[PDB]
RNA sequence: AUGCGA
């Protein structure tokens, strides 16, 4: 008893992204895509934007160099998988509002 | 702090201690006993745990006494089940005897923690920096010498002789 | 009187101890010294200092799968709701990093030349498991979470303590 | 002693002999019966469910068997009704006053009990008991959102260790040591004549001994507490 | 989110103002402006428990054989 | 006769010098469960207990080398304090008598 | 954006053909995530003991390998959504990823099987009649 | 004080 390969995808179609537990952003959220090709190997990036928040995430180099993340499809019925190579992205989401800030101080001087 | 304790097997002596205020303050150490004034190769132990089936603790996003932490030098890199901790730790024992992974420094103290109750709280804290006080032993599986640390030497079922080694228990 | 200690030392052997304390009211206070005083501060502050992070990003950094701690994810809750309640104004991360430097820009010697946020970092760096090194910030950050967990832990008594004076725990 | 002559001794001690016609098994009796009895050392489980649109806690405190604990304390379940309604509810409740200051089947007569006690106590609304032993006393407590947050487990922690099923002032326990060298007798880890006075019909008064020097001087007076420093150097 | 005893801000991950601070239903987020109990509530509960530490007896030693 | 030694030190070079103790009780354990790096977790030994039957006369195993020393060493702990809390005995009272 | 100039505008993307072989709860089709040491091409496989269950160890060249299957992270009969392990589908080089779904229900789905490779080592017995020589 | 004789 073993499940066989049907088909390997090597270039670049899926993707894989760490969030928050709940994320579910916009119906229409866009994810930009980047791509690194480092001597031989690529560092991929993620950056998107929605109304209030802008969500980016980037690839832990470390472990991206020393483990590599494989997705594939599986059907019972035609025993078969699409496989393809997934970057694993992990996410923060800033918004609009965590752009703001204060002064550089608050104004002190010598007796303050 | 006075009391001697049976931790102290192999790295401070038992019977070199002034006698006086100082007694139990001014130990010594063991005739055999070395200490660590570098650190080394950690930059590689990620990548061998990686492949040993480290989750990145990005990817990991678990943490608990439910699970073994494996951390290098107080770099947590990830999380697996105590079964893999036991793995991980054996394996790795090989891997040091061995001679073929060069990102793996001899002198490497291999902390494991299995899960207790009410016990230590697991972990495999690997360390290799510095004034870690290391000691030799025989590791048998391979015949060789292996540097051991007090940490880990805690778990560790050492024999104190050839013909006490008991089996399936002394592992040096 | 439960509480975690963490020695770091930085690469050139010099250290900074670093303590964690449970509160009886759930608030952790993070323990630190500073030109050989000691200070104190609250540890939801130091990690909304590390990184940029939602609440459940750090709820999940805690307790995780560990959903069934009602005793973890009430105290946790007063963690973050008190946080919520003493500092509604520190909504993000660079603000907090305005607080920090703000606080301490009077002894760490760094005014008619750093805005908070440098003096906050720099802070940050100087101080928080500087075993880590500078950029750890995501790594400083789990691990700081990583005493966390094991605090509460501690706190339920379903882990024994250690003992400092075994030369099991000893450099 | 000699350096402190503290009022406060670690293992305070108060000997009492005992009648020859005192039977063991009375003395066993008298040993179980005399120590003190926190409620806590009856209490099985203690759940409470915090539901939040008033504060609801549902405690139910699901205990031992009547049988264990009245045969481990010699206690019964209606014992266990007047401490609750009175002693532990009252404290707890009170102890919850304190952490607000902090922040700033059903039958009619038990309808009627539990009616009773929220008109003894502000903050509980309901009172279901195990009638049939005694196993749980569960009681829901409703709370205004101002009321924000406890650890009402640890409040609850707190609050069994205060409440006694039975206490002697002073005294916690009585032991049946072996009887050796000399009358029978058992030795409390307490000191208080007073209430061996009243136990007078199994303990020939006169020869109540202890180690605590004070007690001594206040009950016994001067050349008591002079023979008992002599004889406990001794 | 809702979990437990906490809710998150479902959009933004913040742990936001408890549906029993609002006077709408939309508990909304201080980081995003989603409806709350204008969308329902989190029943929330807990069954909390004593450790089975708090209570040391013979008796919990009668529970031990 | 009694002109040095007692019928306990005869024993412990001819017979053997038994269970070794600690403020009143046998040897300390490691958090482990492991009375010295050679026992396995729990060993029921009495020699991981530390009962020594090897004497002075044909040796002690290194195990129980390792445990008395613990006897030795605390037994010469209280014997430097026992000193120093009994000086303020002596004083205290001598003060008030003399 | 597009910052570091070590980075890259994408150009291919590929369709996923979610429901070319899809029925609504009637394909048990499978999406898998399965972690793999660099040290291995995956592309130069052929099959998967992944059917092994658990002893799904693997030989690759004489390098031994086990392949953790675990039904939790994902098939949990416990909690609803313990994954952020988020599934981001494209359509064309021209559109960007979606988040997984069975219809548009902004239903996060999850991954069937998870799988880690590891490398295996021999770690070979003691001698116990070589070694305890009296 | 550090160390030490008893
Ligand atoms: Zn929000």
Redesign the pocket.
């Known amino acids: 008893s073993e499940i066989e390969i049907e088909s390997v995808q090597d270039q670049p179609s899926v993707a894989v992204g760490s969030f928050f537990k709940g994320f579910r952003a916009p119906s229409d959220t866009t994810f930009d895509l980047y791509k690194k090709k480092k001597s031989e190997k690529d560092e991929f990036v993620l950056h998107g934007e929605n109304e209030r928040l802008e969500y980016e995430g980037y690839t832990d180099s470390s472990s991206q160099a020393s483990n590599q993340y494989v997705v594939g499809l599986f059907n019972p019925e035609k025993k078969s998988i699409q496989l393809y190579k997934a970057p694993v992205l992990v996410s923060k989401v800033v918004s609009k509002s965590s752009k703001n800030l204060r002064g550089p101080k608050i104004k002190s001087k010598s007796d303050t | 702090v006075r009391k001697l304790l049976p931790e102290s097997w192999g790295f401070l002596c038992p019977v070199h201690t002034?006698?006086?205020?100082?007694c139990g303050?001014?130990n010594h150490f063991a005739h055999k006993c070395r200490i660590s004034t570098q650190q080394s190769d950690v930059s590689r132990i990620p990548s061998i745990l990686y492949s040993l089936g480290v989750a990145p603790a990005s990817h990991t996003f678990a943490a608990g006494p439910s699970l073994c932490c494996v951390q290098i030098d107080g770099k947590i890199i990830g999380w697996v089940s105590h079964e893999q901790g036991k793995i991980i730790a054996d394996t790795l024992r090989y891997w040091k005897v061995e001679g073929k992974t060069p990102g793996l420094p001899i002198d490497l103290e291999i902390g494991y923690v299995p899960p207790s109750t009410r016990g230590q709280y697991p972990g495999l804290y690997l360390f290799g920096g510095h004034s870690r006080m290391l000691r030799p032993v025989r590791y048998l599986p391979l015949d060789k010498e292996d540097i051991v640390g007090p940490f880990e030497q805690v778990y560790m079922n050492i024999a104190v002789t050839p013909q006490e080694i008991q089996n399936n228990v002394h592992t040096h | 009187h439960y509480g975690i200690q963490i020695r770091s030392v930085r690469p050139d052997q010099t250290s900074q101890t670093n303590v964690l304390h449970y509160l009886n009211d759930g608030q952790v206070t993070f323990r630190f010294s500073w030109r050989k005083n000691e200070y104190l501060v609250p540890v939801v502050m130091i990690l909304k200092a590390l990184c940029h992070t939602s609440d459940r990003e750090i709820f999940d950094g805690i307790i995780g799968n560990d959903v069934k701690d009602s005793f973890l994810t009430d105290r946790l809750e007063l963690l973050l709701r008190g946080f919520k309640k003493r500092y509604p104004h520190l909504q993000n991360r660079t603000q907090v990093l305005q607080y920090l430097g703000d606080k301490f820009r009077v002894v760490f010697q760094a005014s008619p030349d750093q805005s908070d946020l440098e003096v906050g970092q720099e802070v940050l760096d100087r101080i928080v498991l500087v075993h880590l090194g500078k950029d750890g910030s995501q790594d400083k950050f789990r691990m700081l979470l990583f005493m966390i967990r094991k605090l509460y832990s501690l706190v339920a008594g379903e882990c024994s303590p250690d003992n400092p004076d075994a030369t099991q725990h000893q450099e | 002693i000699v350096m402190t002559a503290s009022a406060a001794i670690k293992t305070p001690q108060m000997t009492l002999p005992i009648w020859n016609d005192v039977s063991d098994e009375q003395a066993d009796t008298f040993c179980k019966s005399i120590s003190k009895v926190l409620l806590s050392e009856v209490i099985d489980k203690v759940i409470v469910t915090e539901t939040t649109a008033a504060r609801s806690y549902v405690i139910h405190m699901r205990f031992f068997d009547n049988n264990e604990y009245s045969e481990e304390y010699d206690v019964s379940k209606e014992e266990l009704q007047n401490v609750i309604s009175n002693q532990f509810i009252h404290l707890l409740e009170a102890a919850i006053v304190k952490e607000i200051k902090k922040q700033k089947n059903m039958n009619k007569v038990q309808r009627d009990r539990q009616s009773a006690i929220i008109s003894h106590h502000r903050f509980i609304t309901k009172y279901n008991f195990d009638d049939e032993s005694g196993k749980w006393c569960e009681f829901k407590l409703e709370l205004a959102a101002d009321t924000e947050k406890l650890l009402m487990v640890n409040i609850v922690e707190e609050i069994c260790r205060k409440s006694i099923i039975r206490q002697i002032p002073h005294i916690d326990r009585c032991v049946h040591p072996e009887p050796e060298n000399g009358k029978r007798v058992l030795v409390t880890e307490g000191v208080n004549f007073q209430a061996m006075w009243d136990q007078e019909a199994f303990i020939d008064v006169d020869g109540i001994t202890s180690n605590d020097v004070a007690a001594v001087l206040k009950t016994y007076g001067v050349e008591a507490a002079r023979n008992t420093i002599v004889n406990e150097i001794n | 989110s809702v979990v437990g005893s906490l809710i998150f801000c479902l959009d933004c991950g913040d742990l936001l103002e408890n549906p029993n601070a609002v006077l709408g239903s939309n508990v909304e987020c201080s980081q995003c402006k989603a409806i709350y109990p204008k969308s329902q509530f989190s029943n929330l509960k807990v069954v909390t428990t004593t450790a089975d530490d708090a209570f040391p007896s013979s008796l919990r030693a009668k529970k031990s054989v | 006769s009694g002109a040095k030694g007692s019928n306990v030190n005869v024993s412990q070079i001819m017979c053997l010098l038994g269970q070794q103790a600690l403020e009143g009780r046998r040897v300390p354990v490691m958090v482990s469960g492991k009375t010295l790096p050679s026992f396995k977790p729990y060993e029921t030994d009495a020699m991981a207990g530390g009962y020594v039957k090897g004497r002075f006369y044909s040796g002690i195993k290194p195990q129980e080398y390792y445990f008395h020393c613990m006897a030795g060493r605390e037994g010469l702990i209280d014997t430097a304090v026992k000193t120093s809390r009994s000086g303020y005995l002596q004083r205290c009272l001598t003060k008030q008598l003399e | 954006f597009s910052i570091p100039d070590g980075f890259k505008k994408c150009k291919h993307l590929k369709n996923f053909p979610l429901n070319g072989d899809n029925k609504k709860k009637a394909k048990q089709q499978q999406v898998w995530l399965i972690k793999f040491p660099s040290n291995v091409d995956i592309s130069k496989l052929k099959s998967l003991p992944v059917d092994f269950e658990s002893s799904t160890t693997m030989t690759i060249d004489k390098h031994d390998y086990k392949i953790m299957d675990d039904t939790d992270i994902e098939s949990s009969l416990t909690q609803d959504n313990l994954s952020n392990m988020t599934l981001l589908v494209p359509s064309e080089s021209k559109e960007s990823l979606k988040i997984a779904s069975t219809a548009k229900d902004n239903a996060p789905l999850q991954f069937d099987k998870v799988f880690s490779v590891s490398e295996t080592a021999k770690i070979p017995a003691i001698d116990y009649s070589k070694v305890r020589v009296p």
Do not use: A, E, K, T
């Not at chain 2, 002034?18 to 100082?22: K, L, V």
């Open positions: 002034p006698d006086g205020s100082p303050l001014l």
